[PDB]
Amino acid sequence: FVQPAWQIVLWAAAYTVIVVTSVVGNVVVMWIILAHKRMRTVTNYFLVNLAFADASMAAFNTVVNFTYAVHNEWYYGLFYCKFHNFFPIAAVFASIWSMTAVAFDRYMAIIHPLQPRLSATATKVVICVIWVLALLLAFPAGYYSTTETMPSRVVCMIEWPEHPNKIYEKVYHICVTVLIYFLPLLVIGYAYTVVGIRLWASNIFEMLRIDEDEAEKLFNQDVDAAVRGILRNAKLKPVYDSLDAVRRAALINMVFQMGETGVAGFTNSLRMLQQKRWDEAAVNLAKSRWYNQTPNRAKRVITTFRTGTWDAYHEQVSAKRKVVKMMIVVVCTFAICWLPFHIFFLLPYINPDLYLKKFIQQVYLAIMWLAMSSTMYNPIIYCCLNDRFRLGFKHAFR
Ligand SMILES: C[C@@H](O[C@H]1OCCN(Cc2nc(=O)[nH][nH]2)[C@H]1c1ccc(F)cc1)c1cc(C(F)(F)F)cc(C(F)(F)F)c1
């Protein structure tokens, strides 16, 4: 029953913010990639499709969807009634599956580099298929939309054929919710977790392979035998228990080079690590005869004890790591923005009366604002994280 003018003008301002920031931002992003085109990569060519879909939904739907919510009267006739219910499903499908396409491309490059699935001509075919499938799934929702003429007003509502329980409308609604949200988010989730583990994480067998024609190494057995020996030694066991997985590997790396008895000698450095004085321990171990003879290896073991990370056994300036951080943020934004929207339309199946009660109009306006804002965050994410994109937007200033 809450209907104040002070609120309506305030909402329209918050809503127009979406339209302006989504058209400007995404067109600049489209521009940056498409021309120069000295930056036209498989990942970026997909991002262009996502930039189009975003700027597109914002132009067409934000205006029409806000007016109807506020006024409860359809002003744009049967054609735009059908179109405003068709295009959002097509635009959301094309966006989420373009995101998946970038995830597949990174996975195939990080995980399977010998098999190349990157092709210029094919990218256009993928973007082509994405849109064919998108407009097909959106079609039934557009088909059944119609305007009912009444004495006081014109109403835009979607009415499916009269079935004994009208199961088709519900099934379709559920399927759309899967293809547009749950299914691709699961797929994107899987790729970036495997790729996340490969780019950031490592292990003792990888470490020992680096630090240590000719036969192959036999670490598999020796690593478990090194662990058994450390837990037998009274000078080494307490230190080892206090250490995390990454630091435990640094201690075993040394036992592999000097041996249990040799490593047991660094009494002070070992009491420092136990006490968790990483920087202090790192300074002391650098003064050893171990460091003087093998500085490169010793520098790697020391920096592992100090940082508690695999940073020493991975390239310093990594461009592959920057893009994955960007894309993960973009996906998590989508997931956050669309969840209340999907829950909102999913509830009439649990409690039908709960929806047609209280002042849900103020809620639907808050829920619909978040969903539509997903359309503007992407250019901001590209500038906040990536070096070239922020220089590109900087170049678009007069
Ligand atoms: C067109 C509209 O659809 C909803 O409003 C009408 C009823 N409709 C249930 C229905 N009954 C049918 O028979 N067909 N659809 C709703 C619905 C349909 C599919 C869903 F997954 C969730 C809700 C819609 C869809 C999305 C999308 F695509 F993101 F979901 C985004 C937006 C916007 F952002 F512009 F507000 C608007």
Numbering used by the authors: 25 to 226, 1001 to 1010, 1017 to 1117, 237 to 321
Could you pull the original sentences from the published paper?
To improve receptor stability and facilitate crystallization, three mutations, Y1213.41W, Q1654.60A, and T2225.64R, were introduced and 10 residues (residues 227–236 of NK1R) of the third intracellular loop (ICL3) were replaced with a modified T4 lysozyme (mini-T4L). The optimized NK1R protein was co-crystallized with aprepitant, but the crystals diffracted to only about 6 Å. The resolution was improved to 3.2 Å by replacing residue E782.50 with aspartic acid. The two structures are similar, with an overall Cα root mean square deviation (r.m.s.d.) of 0.4 Å. However, relatively large conformational differences of residue side chains were observed around the 2.50 residue. In the NK1R structure with the E782.50D mutation, residue D782.50 forms a hydrogen bond with N3017.49 (2.8 Å). Our data show that mutant E782.50D retained the ability of stimulating SP-induced Gs and Gq signaling as seen with the wild-type receptor, while mutant N3017.49Q exhibited reduced Gs and Gq responses to SP. In contrast to the two single-residue mutations, the double mutation E782.50D/N3017.49Q, which may benefit from the recovery of the hydrogen-bond interaction, preserved both Gs- and Gq-mediated signaling. When the mutation E782.50D was introduced, the fluorine peaks P2a and P2b (−63.1 and −62.9 ppm, respectively) remained separated. Comparing the NK1R structures with different mutations at position 2.50, we observed structural differences in the helical bundle around W6.48 and Y7.53 region, especially in the NPxxY motif, suggesting that the conserved residue E2.50 may regulate receptor signaling via the hydrogen-bond network of this region.
To provide static characterization of cognate ligand recognition by NK1R and modulation of ligand binding by the residue in position 2.50, we determined the crystal structures of two human NK1R variants, with aspartic acid or asparagine at the 2.50 position, bound to the antagonist aprepitant. Aprepitant (2-(R)-(1-(R)-3,5-Bis(trifluoromethyl)phenylethoxy)-3-(S)-(4-fluoro)phenyl-4-(3-oxo-1,2,4-triazol-5-yl)methylmorpholine; also known as MK-869 and L-754030; Merck & Co., West Point, Pennsylvania), is a highly selective NK1R antagonist. The NK1R structure consists of a canonical 7TM helical bundle with three extracellular loops (ECL1–3), three intracellular loops (ICL1–3), and an amphipathic helix VIII. The crystal structure of NK1R bound to aprepitant provides a detailed static picture of how the receptor interacts with its antagonist.
